[PDB]
Design an enzyme around this catalytic site. Structure first.
Site, PDB file in Angstrom:
ATOM      1  N   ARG A  55     -22.285 -37.773 -55.639  1.00 50.71           N
ATOM      2  CA  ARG A  55     -21.201 -36.801 -55.520  1.00 50.71           C
ATOM      3  C   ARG A  55     -20.083 -37.444 -54.735  1.00 50.71           C
ATOM      4  NH1 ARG A  55     -20.699 -31.731 -51.554  1.00 50.71           N
ATOM      5  NH2 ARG A  55     -19.320 -30.394 -52.810  1.00 50.71           N
ATOM      6  N   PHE A  60     -11.843 -36.505 -50.007  1.00 53.85           N
ATOM      7  CA  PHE A  60     -12.813 -35.711 -49.280  1.00 53.85           C
ATOM      8  C   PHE A  60     -13.937 -36.623 -48.785  1.00 53.85           C
ATOM      9  CE2 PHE A  60     -15.269 -32.683 -47.558  1.00 53.85           C
ATOM     10  CZ  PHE A  60     -16.069 -31.868 -48.332  1.00 53.85           C
ATOM     11  N   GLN A  63     -20.877 -38.798 -51.132  1.00 59.36           N
ATOM     12  CA  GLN A  63     -22.211 -38.334 -50.764  1.00 59.36           C
ATOM     13  C   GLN A  63     -23.306 -39.063 -51.525  1.00 59.36           C
ATOM     14  OE1 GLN A  63     -22.577 -34.075 -50.801  1.00 59.36           O
ATOM     15  NE2 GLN A  63     -24.832 -34.092 -50.816  1.00 59.36           N
ATOM     16  N   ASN A 102     -26.552 -31.396 -46.153  1.00 58.48           N
ATOM     17  CA  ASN A 102     -27.637 -30.450 -45.918  1.00 58.48           C
ATOM     18  C   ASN A 102     -27.553 -29.290 -46.903  1.00 58.48           C
ATOM     19  OD1 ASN A 102     -25.859 -29.618 -42.957  1.00 58.48           O
ATOM     20  ND2 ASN A 102     -26.018 -28.326 -44.788  1.00 58.48           N
ATOM     21  N   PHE A 113     -23.013 -38.269 -46.101  1.00 60.89           N
ATOM     22  CA  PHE A 113     -21.718 -38.546 -46.713  1.00 60.89           C
ATOM     23  C   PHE A 113     -20.785 -39.344 -45.813  1.00 60.89           C
ATOM     24  CE2 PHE A 113     -19.293 -35.151 -44.592  1.00 60.89           C
ATOM     25  CZ  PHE A 113     -20.311 -34.361 -44.141  1.00 60.89           C
ATOM     26  N   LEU A 122     -15.940 -28.930 -41.770  1.00 58.40           N
ATOM     27  CA  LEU A 122     -17.371 -29.239 -41.712  1.00 58.40           C
ATOM     28  C   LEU A 122     -17.883 -29.328 -40.279  1.00 58.40           C
ATOM     29  CD1 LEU A 122     -17.385 -31.941 -44.459  1.00 58.40           C
ATOM     30  CD2 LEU A 122     -17.764 -29.468 -44.665  1.00 58.40           C
ATOM     31  N   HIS A 126     -22.192 -29.870 -40.307  1.00 63.45           N
ATOM     32  CA  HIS A 126     -22.833 -31.137 -40.647  1.00 63.45           C
ATOM     33  C   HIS A 126     -22.829 -32.026 -39.419  1.00 63.45           C
ATOM     34  CE1 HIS A 126     -22.941 -30.045 -44.821  1.00 63.45           C
ATOM     35  NE2 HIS A 126     -21.804 -29.429 -44.553  1.00 63.45           N
TER      36      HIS A 126
HETATM   37  C1  LIG Z   1     -20.025 -32.809 -47.769  1.00 64.95           C
HETATM   38  C2  LIG Z   1     -21.526 -32.549 -47.635  1.00 64.95           C
HETATM   39  O1  LIG Z   1     -21.980 -31.638 -48.655  1.00 64.95           O
HETATM   40  C3  LIG Z   1     -23.244 -31.152 -48.539  1.00 64.95           C
HETATM   41  O2  LIG Z   1     -23.981 -31.342 -47.585  1.00 64.95           O
HETATM   42  C4  LIG Z   1     -23.757 -30.343 -49.710  1.00 64.95           C
HETATM   43  O3  LIG Z   1     -24.304 -30.916 -50.657  1.00 64.95           O
HETATM   44  N1  LIG Z   1     -23.601 -29.032 -49.610  1.00 64.95           N
HETATM   45  C5  LIG Z   1     -22.949 -28.450 -48.412  1.00 64.95           C
HETATM   46  C6  LIG Z   1     -23.901 -27.471 -47.749  1.00 64.95           C
HETATM   47  C7  LIG Z   1     -24.457 -26.468 -48.757  1.00 64.95           C
HETATM   48  C8  LIG Z   1     -25.063 -27.139 -49.991  1.00 64.95           C
HETATM   49  C9  LIG Z   1     -24.074 -28.104 -50.663  1.00 64.95           C
END
Ligand SMILES: CCOC(=O)C(=O)N1CCCCC1
Length: 165
Positions: A55, A60, A63, A102, A113, A122, A126
């Site tokens: 991803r 941004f 990941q 997460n 990421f 975030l 995170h």
């Molecule tokens: C930028 C980090 O993105 C993530 O941790 C992620 O995959 N998600 C963010 C938290 C909820 C599920 C999706």
């Protein structure tokens, strides 16, 4: 001791792109830094080598770290399956921040990421645990294989990874 340094060698459909190195803030988030360090060496018998950045969202973050399912639903920590958010001392201040992905509070596994911009929304959600040292140019190159929803146009893999010091 001293904070440790880890590297990833990145490839694009197997063609080498280059090396990114990271400092891991073991001085502030030792449990989280150690997870990523050990997953980068593969010392527990599993880890990041061979996994993809599934991803990547330009402007941004990039990941990756799902080495079990290879799709974003997987991965595990060196502590069992998932572990608590250690703390939120550090902030997502700009490009190069390394932080834990997460599925909500207290669900850290292996996914992480690399920010390519300040992502203050975030903060508190995170766990920030490192920064890029060398190879931000390679992260910028990776970013160009992403898309707005995060699907990559080619496979961006960790060809090799390990500890530098
Ligand atoms: C930028 C980090 O993105 C993530 O941790 C992620 O995959 N998600 C963010 C938290 C909820 C599920 C999706």
């Amino acid at each position: 001791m001293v904070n440790p340094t880890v590297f990833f060698d990145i490839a694009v459909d197997g063609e080498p792109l280059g090396r990114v190195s990271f400092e891991l803030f073991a001085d502030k988030v030792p449990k989280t830094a150690e997870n990523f360090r050990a997953l980068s060496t593969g010392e527990k018998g599993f880890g990041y080598k061979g996994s993809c950045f599934h991803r990547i969202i330009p402007g941004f973050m990039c990941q990756g770290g799902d080495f079990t399912r290879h799709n974003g639903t997987g991965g595990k920590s060196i502590y069992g399956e998932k572990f608590e958010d250690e703390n939120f001392i550090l902030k997502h201040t700009g490009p190069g921040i390394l932080s834990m992905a997460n599925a909500g509070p207290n669900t850290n596994g292996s996914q992480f990421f690399i920010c390519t911009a300040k992502t203050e929304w975030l903060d508190g959600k995170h766990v920030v645990f490192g920064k890029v040292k060398e190879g931000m140019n390679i992260v910028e190159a990776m970013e160009r294989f992403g898309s707005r929803n995060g699907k990559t146009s080619k496979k961006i893999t960790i060809a090799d990874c390990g500890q530098l010091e």
